[model samples]
Target: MFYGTVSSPDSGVYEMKIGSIIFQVASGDITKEEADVIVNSTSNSFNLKAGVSKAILECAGQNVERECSQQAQQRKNDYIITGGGFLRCKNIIHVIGGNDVKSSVSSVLQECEKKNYSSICLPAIGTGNAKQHPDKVAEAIIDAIEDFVQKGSAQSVKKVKVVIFLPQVLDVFYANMKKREG
Candidate 1:
């Protein structure tokens, strides 16, 4: 089972408990030599761009890959609804969160369920171009996870890692995780 352990560099890796894993935002991708599996925050683009989506895509570079939406031409507000790939790592599982809560995120949730990846890492959606509030985005993402977990799609999903690039963003996610845990 994948775990969900929130930790920082000063905290070190503490994977002793189940339902948790330790991670720090690092350069390049997580190598198999360093970890059992490596999850990268990616977007639907072929190459890494400016946001978390690009980070994951750039990290997923092994052979070749790209992002696609289950429903093309259907975008959420100004946000684009596209397919996020499962590249590199042991297997790439793309979980979409609310980039724009103005629209229903059920489609992305459904996609995550359909894919049914065991362990997954995600970036706070809409935090970037979507302009959604961080706390609101966190709530929306957690809700999506709850919805998926209750539905059995995420049954195999033992671990849910929230990867933040910047320390500020990391703090936001970290604070939210604390609130959720408490």
Candidate 2:
């Protein structure tokens, strides 16, 4: 059983325990997440098109887009940080996971540690426009978080949540998390 539950406005919320940290999997608008940081999945070219980017940009404002445009995304897994714009979080981590969801997750966690952030919420990385299988995306994210904790790299984060906008995606994540735990 889960040690505790997360409070969210959406339905189908599940929780997992990863070592000492809590991982929340919820089906809801990621823009409404109240974590210390919110992760944004985007392109290496910083194009804010449909999917998570569009919603984030629409809520956060054009400054986020401008800041993203100024950054040099050197590689697919590379990430850049920017102000959270008008969002609740303090910062936004724009990651170009593309087809490499695992590496993208790892990079985001590393940044969290660097910033000494206590909590963060992310989307189902490659399952969006990149079209990764939801089950595989779930595994990649959980595996990356477990690796981060096992290596003693997640020193600051107490909570890590994967917020998916679709119930079908949340189901896959919830299933994989249970399998991994059992």
Candidate 3:
């Protein structure tokens, strides 16, 4: 299993060992291309029409489809993005998750399942403008990722990353993972 942490000022990493796969946790403004593949907690239009989407367009990869609400003025489709991340992956999957969540994470996993990509790294959703509890969001993410693995979707994608931007956020994630493992 590949386990690593991104030791950098702008990035944070959480490593997970599942079966034979090695998952790395990293943070920063790095593009999805920097990783094997990319996953973002983005709305719909931002996934499809934003400048970031245009950048991913050059990579010739599929973007996973998920739904969430717009949380900011910059958001027009509830999926609007003023900034971009995950610029480095072979492919980028956009999963929309927000506060007052109406979409089931299992459904997002299913959508990602259809893609059969090899790896994906993500950010904590619902924290930006959605205002959902981080712990709750983390739980949902853990379940969704586990479900993806259980359903055989994870067979193709070996690694999944959750990048935290802030130290406090990073600490909480670290604590949660430790709690689950310990």
Best by lDDT: 2
lDDT of each: 0.43, 0.80, 0.49
Pitting candidate 1 against candidate 2, the one with the higher TM-score is: 2
Residue lDDT tens for model 1, 80-152: 3232234434444333333234233444444444556445444555676545677786666555555555555
What global local distance difference test value does model 3 have? 0.49
Q: Number of the top candidate by TM-score?
A: 2
lDDT of 2 at 8: 40
Q: Which pairs of residues collide in candidate 2?
A: none
* Model 1 error, position 96 (Å): 7.4
Each candidate structure's TM-score, on Cα atoms with residue i matched to residue i, is 0.54, 0.89, 0.60
Per-residue alpha-carbon lDDT of candidate 2 for residues 1-72, written as tens digits (9 for 90 to 100): 223333343456677678778888877788887878899887777675788888988998988888887775
Higher-ranked by TM-score: 1 or 3: 3
**What is candidate 3's TM-score against the reference?**
0.60
Per-residue CA lDDT of model 3 for 11-41, tens digit only, reads 3456655443454544444343355545555
